[PDB]
Amino acid sequence: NQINFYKDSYAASASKQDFSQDPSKFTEPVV
Amino acid sequence: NQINFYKDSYAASASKQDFSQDPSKFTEPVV
Amino acid sequence: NQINFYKDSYAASASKQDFSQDPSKFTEPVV
Amino acid sequence: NQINFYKDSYAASASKQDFSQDPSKFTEPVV
Amino acid sequence: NQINFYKDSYAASASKQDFSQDPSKFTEPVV
Amino acid sequence: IESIIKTATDTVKSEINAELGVVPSLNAVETGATSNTEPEEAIQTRTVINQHGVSETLVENFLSRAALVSKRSFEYKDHTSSTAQTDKNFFKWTINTRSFVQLRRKLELFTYLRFDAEITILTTVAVNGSNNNTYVGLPDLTLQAMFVPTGALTPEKQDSFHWQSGSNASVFFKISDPPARMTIPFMCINSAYSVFYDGFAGFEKTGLYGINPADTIGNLCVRIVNEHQPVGFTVTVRVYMKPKHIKAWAPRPPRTLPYMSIANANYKGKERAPNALNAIIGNRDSVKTMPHNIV
Amino acid sequence: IESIIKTATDTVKSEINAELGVVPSLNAVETGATSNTEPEEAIQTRTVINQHGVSETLVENFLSRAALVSKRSFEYKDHTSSTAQTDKNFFKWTINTRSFVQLRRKLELFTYLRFDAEITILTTVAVNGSNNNTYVGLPDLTLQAMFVPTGALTPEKQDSFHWQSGSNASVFFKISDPPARMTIPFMCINSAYSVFYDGFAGFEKTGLYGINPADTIGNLCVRIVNEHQPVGFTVTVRVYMKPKHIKAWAPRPPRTLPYMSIANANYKGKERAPNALNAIIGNRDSVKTMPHNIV
Amino acid sequence: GVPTYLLPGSGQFLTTDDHSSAPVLPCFNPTPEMHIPGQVRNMLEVVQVESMMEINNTESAVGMERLKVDISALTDVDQLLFNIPLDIQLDGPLRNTLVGNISRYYTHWSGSLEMTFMFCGSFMATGKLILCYTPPGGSCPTTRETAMLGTHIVWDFGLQSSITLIIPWISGSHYRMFNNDAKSTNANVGYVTCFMQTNLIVPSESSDTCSLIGFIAAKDDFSLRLMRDSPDIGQIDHLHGAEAAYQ
Amino acid sequence: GVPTYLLPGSGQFLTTDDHSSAPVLPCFNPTPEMHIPGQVRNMLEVVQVESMMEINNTESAVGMERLKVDISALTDVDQLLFNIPLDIQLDGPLRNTLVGNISRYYTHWSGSLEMTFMFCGSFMATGKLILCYTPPGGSCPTTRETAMLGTHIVWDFGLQSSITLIIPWISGSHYRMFNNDAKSTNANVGYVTCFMQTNLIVPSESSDTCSLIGFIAAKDDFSLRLMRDSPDIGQIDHLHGAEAAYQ
């Protein structure tokens, strides 16, 4: 699904695959 | 035969492959 | 050599590969 | 390196790969 | 990442992969 | 149930089945449709293998025909000079199926459809003849097509500063170009588009009837990016939606009468038959009088 | 921690949990947000499997919407005849997010963002009507868009000989064409773009406040390649930046007041509520008086 | 790859294309699909169900009295009750059917037609009745002996009170079309003619206006092919709400 | 490969495209990423945190006095303290929340809302207090007995000094939208109504202007869908620095 034919890693598709997230940084910033 | 190069599953080709169908829902809606 | 990316079998390339032929239908239509 | 997607062998890329050559046809056309 | 479909090796992509380098040619040109 | 049929079903050979105690043809209408198949009774069939096309009559094949949903021939000029609610180089088309009766009838075949709207925006230019201007070429205007959900503020001008599109979905496509093949997804908070809605949008009693609040996709605000030309053109933006990824529910009677309003299903037929209120089918001279007869 | 969640979390069945000694709902605000989930207390929930869309509300999905950052309708004519600081067929737009408030608010949601700027330059032509010129067709100008880093000398003319681009990045794209989909990388000497910068750019006391020297990407000098036409056009170059490859840090209060300046975050709200200085939210008639009520 | 030549069929919006299209909403997760009842994965499921024809296509039959047909106790034998032009496209009794409105979207149609007629009479209303379907090639019959030679079926009313005649698929071609010329080999399906067999016997206390309700459905071999645009609706002007949804 | 036909969706700048784009800097190695704190990989992490509503949406409440609500020792029982239009889009108390400003970027919103109210009073300021959330379908309640039938929770102030009411996700659809018509089945979330339960008991040395600070957060099932452009900001003119960053 990626048509990145350029030689730079920044010029790829918009990576909408960072599904992992840590809400405890802002919701529960204790101990 | 699918040229879906986008990152969304909705943006694919028109799926004309749902050959399975249940006519007894509307023809014989009994028992 | 076929770039048929459509979902219909009729929309493919012009099949110029039917090399088999029976000339005895019209040349010798006997017995 | 060949993008010949047509059904004819003549319509391919210009074959610049015939490296073999016999100069003795014209240089030494004897015996 | 290379879309070199031509028959010449010079006509390829700009090879930004020559990471190896010898700085001692110009920094320390001794012994 | 569990039918994965791809072709039409073959009929088998039927014989003289004159049997006492059971009968195929005398069915009961007052449950549903009948189960009297062709080799069961009423004919002595032959075994014919049926290889007929069922893919062409698929519901996705029925409904993924890109038909018109909004044709706006908005006038592209220096609207500033003199314009009142005159599509000042942009129209805020609220996305409704119901404007054009062909695809409206196709989607009002079914109560519920989950689909993705492959929206193709074909835009044509015509030089307006009210000012007696010359042809002077058809310009290649880049035409922004911003889809705003409901709740987002629709723009009020051509340069309304709501065309920045920080989070709004928009395409920037010229006219001397292929049309904007864009796919708006299943933009419904429910699991289907209630094409028919026997309910009111608001919780108040004075809400408008038949408009599902779940099916308010939003507005497709289409504008002209570049500034006004000295010669006026009539930019006609035709948005065609191809219901793609079709999942349909509860098929319905098709709309026989001509449509009247977008927001509701109000009806008034033609002045006589056909497709009239008192006569949907065109009348014959008598019950036994037969039309279109070879003699 | 270690949450790799892709869908919304399912709630479990809750019973009568009336237990002495511990309580879920009475939390402490004065640490942070609370941990009282739905089946813990305050409701007797049902086990519902939650399959809702979380990919659409990803921070990359939030921020990779290509919105406007500079709209310059520079006048393309023989500027030589008569022009003073009038965009002589070229403008030296210093690359700042802050010009258009939609994407400015989207990027000022976060203190820090490492991203690659997918810059799409959509250019539209309009014949200027001050000279009462005819339409005479919209020309297909090749439009050079040179991105110069800081320290590089910006050009001063259309044919300024700084458009040679021996090392400067530039694209040469026409208008009767798709727009220049170019990606400017993470052009920051720090590991993120400090969208907010509580500091001064220079080491001197008279430096300008809020402009990060690390976030000076440079100028995007956009010019017209070919020479001046006898008929003047208004070339409107709209650069749209899609924050791609999004990594965001420290989410912030969104900007409620209307923006005032690009270089700083100076504020003045509307003259009454909503979005005013003394009242961000539009006022109700009383504390117990409830607006938008179905009766 | 890099060497790409544009086909003649480029830049064309083929309304019936299936090419993938850019997602406007980029990481948009749609609503989870619930098990809604009545999913129709094929229109041939809609056509396989019953649908009334308007047998009284009559100016006297206004409104409700078009679906039903008032047959009475005629004093003559072998009498014609009604004839149905089995023409789905020629705005006949069928047009307004789920086998006919959907097949008006399709240029080609095939498959055996179902012909189910119910008797909306009293329980003491008795009498045999014959549903003659004749293949095309001649005129529509008006007498019993010239119509019983075709596909006919005798229906005593009895207890189940509904017969299902099956129209067989007789055609030289594989798909009867809707050429808008009923009298066309490739368009005419035939004529379904209804006759008295042993007359409608009704008592004195029962009404002598006993009523037949017919239905035409499709069978499992029915198929529609080239999809056209149904001539049922007509947008001669813009509907209400146009120039207002635009606002 | 070589045979390529252009799609109808070609040459279109879909603002929400993800297609790879030419690198302007060709072998540009970016800055190495350091472990900066507070990475937000999903906005639903921002919405899951507390945010004050402006309960006093009042012309007398100027500036600082909008977040707090001055409740006193009323001499009547079952008295209404305040009602919150749980409308994120209709510029209500919520609009100015991290669950509301971010959901004003999204046409669709779903998930259970958190409703955490803290008591900014003295330690000797005591009294039970009830947070009634009613599902939509009727009017906003003004009395206790017609509001305790909904989602209510009794809050003695005690030691922790903050309750967290949880708004449950009651909707016919899967996602309440922001249709800008609060009174819409698909838009109304309901009404959160606050009542006296056992009255605010305060001593003489404590002030009889005891203050409630509320917050609305999101839960782990909350989700926003179709992304729109928040109506909070308005660029009716060019900002300062425009025509100067251009210079």
Short mmCIF file of N, CA and C in Angstrom, two decimals, chain G residues 130-250:
data_model
loop_
_atom_site.label_atom_id
_atom_site.label_comp_id
_atom_site.label_asym_id
_atom_site.label_seq_id
_atom_site.Cartn_x
_atom_site.Cartn_y
_atom_site.Cartn_z
N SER G 130 -8.25 45.52 -13.15
CA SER G 130 -8.00 46.94 -12.93
C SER G 130 -7.64 47.65 -14.23
N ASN G 131 -6.98 46.95 -15.14
CA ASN G 131 -6.63 47.49 -16.45
C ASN G 131 -7.72 47.24 -17.49
N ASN G 132 -8.84 46.63 -17.08
CA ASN G 132 -9.98 46.28 -17.94
C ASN G 132 -9.55 45.40 -19.12
N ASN G 133 -8.63 44.48 -18.86
CA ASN G 133 -8.18 43.54 -19.88
C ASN G 133 -9.23 42.46 -20.11
N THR G 134 -9.19 41.87 -21.30
CA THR G 134 -10.07 40.76 -21.61
C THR G 134 -9.54 39.47 -20.98
N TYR G 135 -10.33 38.40 -21.12
CA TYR G 135 -9.96 37.12 -20.53
C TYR G 135 -8.75 36.52 -21.23
N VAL G 136 -8.79 36.46 -22.57
CA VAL G 136 -7.76 36.04 -23.53
C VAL G 136 -7.03 34.74 -23.12
N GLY G 137 -7.75 33.85 -22.44
CA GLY G 137 -7.19 32.58 -22.03
C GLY G 137 -6.35 32.65 -20.76
N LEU G 138 -6.35 31.56 -19.99
CA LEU G 138 -5.51 31.45 -18.81
C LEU G 138 -4.23 30.71 -19.16
N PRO G 139 -3.07 31.36 -19.05
CA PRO G 139 -1.83 30.76 -19.56
C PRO G 139 -1.27 29.68 -18.65
N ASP G 140 -0.50 28.78 -19.26
CA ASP G 140 0.14 27.68 -18.55
C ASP G 140 1.59 28.03 -18.20
N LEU G 141 1.72 28.90 -17.21
CA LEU G 141 3.03 29.36 -16.75
C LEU G 141 3.75 28.28 -15.98
N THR G 142 5.01 28.03 -16.33
CA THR G 142 5.86 27.23 -15.48
C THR G 142 6.31 28.09 -14.30
N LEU G 143 6.04 27.62 -13.09
CA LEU G 143 6.21 28.42 -11.88
C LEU G 143 7.25 27.75 -11.00
N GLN G 144 8.41 28.39 -10.86
CA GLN G 144 9.48 27.86 -10.02
C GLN G 144 9.21 28.16 -8.56
N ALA G 145 9.40 27.14 -7.71
CA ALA G 145 9.19 27.24 -6.27
C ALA G 145 10.49 26.81 -5.59
N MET G 146 11.35 27.78 -5.30
CA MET G 146 12.65 27.49 -4.71
C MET G 146 12.57 27.64 -3.20
N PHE G 147 12.93 26.58 -2.48
CA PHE G 147 13.03 26.61 -1.03
C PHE G 147 14.48 26.91 -0.66
N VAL G 148 14.71 28.06 -0.04
CA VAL G 148 16.03 28.45 0.43
C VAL G 148 16.07 28.30 1.95
N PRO G 149 17.08 27.63 2.50
CA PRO G 149 17.29 27.67 3.95
C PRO G 149 17.70 29.06 4.41
N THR G 150 17.68 29.25 5.72
CA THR G 150 18.17 30.49 6.30
C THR G 150 19.69 30.58 6.17
N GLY G 151 20.18 31.80 5.95
CA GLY G 151 21.55 32.05 5.60
C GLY G 151 21.78 32.20 4.11
N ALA G 152 21.02 31.47 3.30
CA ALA G 152 21.07 31.66 1.86
C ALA G 152 20.39 32.96 1.48
N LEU G 153 20.96 33.65 0.49
CA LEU G 153 20.44 34.95 0.08
C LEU G 153 19.16 34.78 -0.73
N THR G 154 18.09 35.41 -0.27
CA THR G 154 16.85 35.42 -1.02
C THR G 154 16.99 36.29 -2.27
N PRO G 155 16.32 35.92 -3.36
CA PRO G 155 16.39 36.74 -4.58
C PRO G 155 15.66 38.06 -4.41
N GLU G 156 16.02 39.02 -5.26
CA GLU G 156 15.42 40.35 -5.24
C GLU G 156 14.65 40.69 -6.50
N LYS G 157 14.77 39.89 -7.56
CA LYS G 157 14.06 40.11 -8.81
C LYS G 157 13.47 38.80 -9.31
N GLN G 158 12.71 38.88 -10.40
CA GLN G 158 12.24 37.67 -11.06
C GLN G 158 13.40 36.95 -11.75
N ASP G 159 14.19 37.69 -12.52
CA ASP G 159 15.43 37.17 -13.10
C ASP G 159 16.63 37.63 -12.27
N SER G 160 16.67 37.15 -11.03
CA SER G 160 17.64 37.63 -10.04
C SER G 160 18.93 36.82 -10.01
N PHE G 161 19.06 35.81 -10.87
CA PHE G 161 20.21 34.90 -10.99
C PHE G 161 20.47 34.07 -9.73
N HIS G 162 19.56 34.11 -8.75
CA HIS G 162 19.56 33.20 -7.62
C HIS G 162 18.63 32.02 -7.86
N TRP G 163 17.97 31.98 -9.01
CA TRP G 163 17.11 30.89 -9.41
C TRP G 163 17.85 29.83 -10.21
N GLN G 164 19.19 29.91 -10.25
CA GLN G 164 19.99 28.90 -10.92
C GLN G 164 19.90 27.55 -10.21
N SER G 165 19.79 27.57 -8.88
CA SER G 165 19.59 26.39 -8.03
C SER G 165 20.73 25.38 -8.18
N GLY G 166 21.95 25.85 -7.95
CA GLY G 166 23.09 24.95 -7.95
C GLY G 166 23.06 23.97 -6.79
N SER G 167 22.61 24.43 -5.63
CA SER G 167 22.39 23.57 -4.48
C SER G 167 21.04 23.77 -3.81
N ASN G 168 20.29 24.81 -4.17
CA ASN G 168 19.00 25.07 -3.55
C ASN G 168 17.93 24.16 -4.14
N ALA G 169 17.01 23.72 -3.30
CA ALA G 169 15.93 22.85 -3.74
C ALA G 169 14.83 23.68 -4.40
N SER G 170 14.47 23.30 -5.62
CA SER G 170 13.43 23.99 -6.36
C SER G 170 12.68 22.99 -7.23
N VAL G 171 11.41 23.28 -7.47
CA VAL G 171 10.59 22.51 -8.40
C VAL G 171 10.16 23.43 -9.53
N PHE G 172 10.00 22.86 -10.72
CA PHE G 172 9.59 23.60 -11.92
C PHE G 172 8.33 22.91 -12.43
N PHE G 173 7.18 23.45 -12.07
CA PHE G 173 5.90 22.84 -12.43
C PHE G 173 4.99 23.89 -13.05
N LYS G 174 4.26 23.47 -14.08
CA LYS G 174 3.32 24.34 -14.76
C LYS G 174 2.00 24.40 -13.99
N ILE G 175 1.10 25.25 -14.46
CA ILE G 175 -0.21 25.40 -13.83
C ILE G 175 -1.23 24.46 -14.45
N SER G 176 -1.16 24.23 -15.76
CA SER G 176 -1.98 23.20 -16.41
C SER G 176 -1.34 21.84 -16.18
N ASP G 177 -1.42 21.40 -14.93
CA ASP G 177 -0.67 20.27 -14.40
C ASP G 177 -1.20 19.96 -13.00
N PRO G 178 -0.92 18.77 -12.47
CA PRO G 178 -1.13 18.56 -11.05
C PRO G 178 -0.21 19.44 -10.24
N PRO G 179 -0.62 19.83 -9.03
CA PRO G 179 0.22 20.71 -8.21
C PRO G 179 1.48 20.01 -7.72
N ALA G 180 2.45 20.82 -7.30
CA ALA G 180 3.77 20.32 -6.93
C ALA G 180 3.70 19.63 -5.58
N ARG G 181 3.45 18.32 -5.61
CA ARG G 181 3.49 17.51 -4.40
C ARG G 181 4.96 17.28 -4.04
N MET G 182 5.50 18.17 -3.21
CA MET G 182 6.87 18.10 -2.74
C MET G 182 6.87 17.91 -1.23
N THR G 183 7.88 17.23 -0.72
CA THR G 183 7.99 16.98 0.71
C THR G 183 9.26 17.66 1.20
N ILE G 184 9.10 18.74 1.95
CA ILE G 184 10.23 19.29 2.71
C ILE G 184 10.40 18.48 3.98
N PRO G 185 11.62 18.00 4.27
CA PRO G 185 11.83 17.10 5.41
C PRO G 185 11.73 17.78 6.76
N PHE G 186 12.16 17.04 7.78
CA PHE G 186 12.30 17.58 9.12
C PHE G 186 13.47 18.56 9.13
N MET G 187 13.18 19.79 8.70
CA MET G 187 14.20 20.83 8.56
C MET G 187 14.32 21.61 9.86
N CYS G 188 14.80 20.92 10.89
CA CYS G 188 15.02 21.52 12.19
C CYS G 188 16.32 20.99 12.76
N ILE G 189 17.11 21.88 13.35
CA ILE G 189 18.35 21.46 13.99
C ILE G 189 18.09 20.80 15.34
N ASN G 190 16.90 20.98 15.90
CA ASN G 190 16.51 20.28 17.11
C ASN G 190 15.69 19.05 16.74
N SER G 191 15.32 18.26 17.74
CA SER G 191 14.60 17.01 17.52
C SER G 191 13.10 17.20 17.37
N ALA G 192 12.59 18.42 17.49
CA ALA G 192 11.19 18.71 17.23
C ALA G 192 11.06 20.16 16.80
N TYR G 193 9.95 20.47 16.13
CA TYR G 193 9.59 21.87 15.91
C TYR G 193 8.95 22.40 17.18
N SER G 194 9.63 23.34 17.84
CA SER G 194 9.01 24.02 18.97
C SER G 194 7.98 25.00 18.45
N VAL G 195 6.73 24.53 18.31
CA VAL G 195 5.63 25.36 17.83
C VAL G 195 5.41 26.53 18.77
N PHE G 196 5.55 26.29 20.06
CA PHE G 196 5.68 27.34 21.05
C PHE G 196 7.11 27.38 21.57
N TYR G 197 7.62 28.59 21.75
CA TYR G 197 9.00 28.81 22.15
C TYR G 197 9.00 29.93 23.18
N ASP G 198 9.17 29.59 24.45
CA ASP G 198 9.26 30.59 25.51
C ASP G 198 10.70 31.08 25.63
N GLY G 199 11.14 31.76 24.59
CA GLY G 199 12.52 32.20 24.53
C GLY G 199 12.70 33.17 23.39
N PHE G 200 13.92 33.69 23.30
CA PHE G 200 14.25 34.71 22.32
C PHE G 200 15.23 34.12 21.32
N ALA G 201 15.07 34.53 20.05
CA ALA G 201 15.84 33.92 18.97
C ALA G 201 17.32 34.29 19.06
N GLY G 202 17.62 35.56 19.31
CA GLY G 202 18.99 36.01 19.43
C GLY G 202 19.50 35.95 20.86
N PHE G 203 20.82 35.99 20.99
CA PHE G 203 21.44 36.08 22.30
C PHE G 203 21.33 37.48 22.89
N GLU G 204 21.07 38.48 22.06
CA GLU G 204 20.88 39.84 22.55
C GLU G 204 19.52 39.97 23.22
N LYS G 205 19.37 41.05 24.00
CA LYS G 205 18.13 41.29 24.73
C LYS G 205 17.01 41.78 23.81
N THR G 206 17.35 42.32 22.64
CA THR G 206 16.38 42.90 21.73
C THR G 206 15.92 41.92 20.66
N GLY G 207 16.16 40.62 20.85
CA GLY G 207 15.66 39.64 19.91
C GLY G 207 14.16 39.50 19.97
N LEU G 208 13.59 39.01 18.87
CA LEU G 208 12.14 38.84 18.79
C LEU G 208 11.73 37.59 19.56
N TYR G 209 10.60 37.69 20.26
CA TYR G 209 10.20 36.65 21.19
C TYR G 209 9.27 35.64 20.52
N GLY G 210 9.49 34.36 20.82
CA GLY G 210 8.60 33.31 20.39
C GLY G 210 9.02 32.60 19.12
N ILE G 211 9.89 33.21 18.32
CA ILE G 211 10.37 32.57 17.10
C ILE G 211 11.56 31.70 17.48
N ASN G 212 11.40 30.39 17.34
CA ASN G 212 12.50 29.47 17.56
C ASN G 212 13.49 29.60 16.42
N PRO G 213 14.78 29.85 16.70
CA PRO G 213 15.79 29.79 15.63
C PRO G 213 15.95 28.40 15.02
N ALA G 214 15.59 27.35 15.74
CA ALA G 214 15.63 26.00 15.18
C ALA G 214 14.51 25.80 14.16
N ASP G 215 13.38 26.48 14.34
CA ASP G 215 12.22 26.29 13.48
C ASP G 215 12.18 27.25 12.30
N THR G 216 13.22 28.06 12.11
CA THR G 216 13.33 28.84 10.88
C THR G 216 13.70 27.88 9.77
N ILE G 217 12.67 27.38 9.08
CA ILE G 217 12.88 26.48 7.95
C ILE G 217 13.54 27.22 6.80
N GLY G 218 13.16 28.48 6.60
CA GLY G 218 13.71 29.32 5.56
C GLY G 218 12.60 30.03 4.83
N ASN G 219 12.89 30.43 3.60
CA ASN G 219 11.92 31.06 2.73
C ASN G 219 11.58 30.12 1.58
N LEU G 220 10.32 30.13 1.17
CA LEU G 220 9.87 29.41 -0.02
C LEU G 220 9.66 30.46 -1.10
N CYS G 221 10.74 30.80 -1.81
CA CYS G 221 10.68 31.80 -2.86
C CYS G 221 10.04 31.19 -4.10
N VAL G 222 8.86 31.69 -4.46
CA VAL G 222 8.08 31.17 -5.57
C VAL G 222 8.09 32.24 -6.65
N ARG G 223 8.46 31.86 -7.88
CA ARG G 223 8.58 32.84 -8.95
C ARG G 223 7.92 32.33 -10.22
N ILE G 224 7.81 33.25 -11.17
CA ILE G 224 7.38 32.96 -12.53
C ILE G 224 8.62 32.83 -13.40
N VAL G 225 8.75 31.72 -14.11
CA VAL G 225 9.95 31.48 -14.91
C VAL G 225 9.95 32.35 -16.17
N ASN G 226 8.88 32.28 -16.96
CA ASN G 226 8.87 32.98 -18.24
C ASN G 226 8.65 34.48 -18.05
N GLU G 227 8.96 35.24 -19.09
CA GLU G 227 8.97 36.69 -19.03
C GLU G 227 7.55 37.25 -19.01
N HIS G 228 7.46 38.57 -18.82
CA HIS G 228 6.18 39.22 -18.61
C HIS G 228 5.35 39.27 -19.89
N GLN G 229 4.07 38.94 -19.75
CA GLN G 229 3.06 39.02 -20.79
C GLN G 229 2.52 40.44 -20.90
N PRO G 230 2.05 40.85 -22.09
CA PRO G 230 1.42 42.17 -22.21
C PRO G 230 0.12 42.32 -21.44
N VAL G 231 -0.57 41.22 -21.14
CA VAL G 231 -1.80 41.24 -20.35
C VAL G 231 -1.49 40.72 -18.95
N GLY G 232 -1.93 41.46 -17.94
CA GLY G 232 -1.58 41.15 -16.56
C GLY G 232 -2.49 40.10 -15.96
N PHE G 233 -1.90 39.14 -15.26
CA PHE G 233 -2.63 38.10 -14.54
C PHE G 233 -2.35 38.21 -13.05
N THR G 234 -3.27 37.70 -12.25
CA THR G 234 -3.12 37.65 -10.80
C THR G 234 -2.88 36.19 -10.44
N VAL G 235 -1.60 35.82 -10.33
CA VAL G 235 -1.22 34.45 -10.03
C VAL G 235 -1.41 34.23 -8.53
N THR G 236 -2.30 33.33 -8.13
CA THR G 236 -2.53 33.12 -6.69
C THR G 236 -1.90 31.82 -6.27
N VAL G 237 -0.76 31.86 -5.59
CA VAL G 237 -0.04 30.62 -5.21
C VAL G 237 -0.47 30.22 -3.80
N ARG G 238 -1.16 29.09 -3.67
CA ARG G 238 -1.61 28.61 -2.35
C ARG G 238 -0.75 27.40 -1.99
N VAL G 239 0.09 27.54 -0.98
CA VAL G 239 0.96 26.42 -0.53
C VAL G 239 0.21 25.70 0.59
N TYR G 240 0.01 24.40 0.44
CA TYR G 240 -0.69 23.60 1.47
C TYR G 240 0.30 22.63 2.03
N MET G 241 0.42 22.58 3.35
CA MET G 241 1.42 21.69 3.99
C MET G 241 0.70 20.57 4.73
N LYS G 242 1.03 19.32 4.43
CA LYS G 242 0.43 18.17 5.15
C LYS G 242 1.45 17.65 6.16
N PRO G 243 1.37 18.01 7.45
CA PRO G 243 2.30 17.45 8.39
C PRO G 243 2.28 15.95 8.22
N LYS G 244 3.31 15.39 7.59
CA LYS G 244 3.40 13.92 7.44
C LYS G 244 4.40 13.38 8.46
N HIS G 245 4.47 12.07 8.65
CA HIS G 245 5.36 11.46 9.67
C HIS G 245 5.21 12.27 10.95
N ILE G 246 4.08 12.11 11.64
CA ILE G 246 3.76 12.94 12.80
C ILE G 246 4.27 12.26 14.06
N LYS G 247 5.05 13.00 14.85
CA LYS G 247 5.39 12.64 16.22
C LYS G 247 5.16 13.89 17.06
N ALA G 248 4.13 13.87 17.90
CA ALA G 248 3.72 15.05 18.65
C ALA G 248 4.07 14.90 20.12
N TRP G 249 4.34 16.03 20.77
CA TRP G 249 4.70 16.05 22.18
C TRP G 249 3.97 17.17 22.89
N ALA G 250 3.59 16.91 24.16
CA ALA G 250 2.98 17.85 25.10
C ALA G 250 1.75 18.55 24.54
#
